[PDB]
From Swiss-Prot:
It comes from Homo sapiens. Proteolytically processed under normal cellular conditions. Cleavage either by alpha-secretase, beta-secretase or theta-secretase leads to generation and extracellular release of soluble APP peptides, S-APP-alpha and S-APP-beta, and the retention of corresponding membrane-anchored C-terminal fragments, C80, C83 and C99. Subsequent processing of C80 and C83 by gamma-secretase yields P3 peptides. This is the major secretory pathway and is non-amyloidogenic. Proteolytically cleaved by caspases during neuronal apoptosis. The transmembrane helix undergoes a conformation change and unravels partially when bound to PSEN1, facilitating cleavage by PSEN1. The basolateral sorting signal (BaSS) is required for sorting of membrane proteins to the basolateral surface of epithelial cells. Changing residue 46 to K: Decreased amyloid-beta protein 42/total amyloid-beta ratio. Changing residue 46 to I: In AD1; increased amyloid-beta protein 42/40 ratio. Residues 24-51 are annotated as: Interaction with PSEN1. The record marks 35 as: Susceptible to oxidation. This is Amyloid-beta precursor protein. Zn(2+) 2 binds at residues 6, 10, 13-14. Changing residue 24 to C: Causes formation of an artifactual disulfide bond with PSEN1. Glycans are attached at residue 10. Chelation of metal ions, notably copper, iron and zinc, can induce histidine-bridging between amyloid-beta molecules resulting in amyloid-beta-metal aggregates. The affinity for copper is much higher than for other transient metals and is increased under acidic conditions. Extracellular zinc-binding increases binding of heparin to APP and inhibits collagen-binding.
Length: 55
């Protein structure tokens, strides 16, 4: 039993982008730190997809 419990997608897992973060960030704060970083790095890429079609 592990499939009906309310936290099944956290109790049971396999591949996820945060497991690169777990590699560089020493600790939880830095591991989410880095994932919030990732959203800032991916948001800048999305801005620059848009300015060459708009300008």
């Amino acid at each position: 039993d592990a499939e009906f419990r309310h936290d099944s997608g956290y109790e049971v897992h396999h591949q996820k982008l945060v497991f690169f973060a777990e590699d560089v960030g020493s600790n939880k704060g830095a591991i989410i730190g880095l994932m919030v970083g990732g959203v800032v790095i991916a948001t800048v890429i999305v801005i620059t997809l848009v300015m060459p079609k708009k300008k």
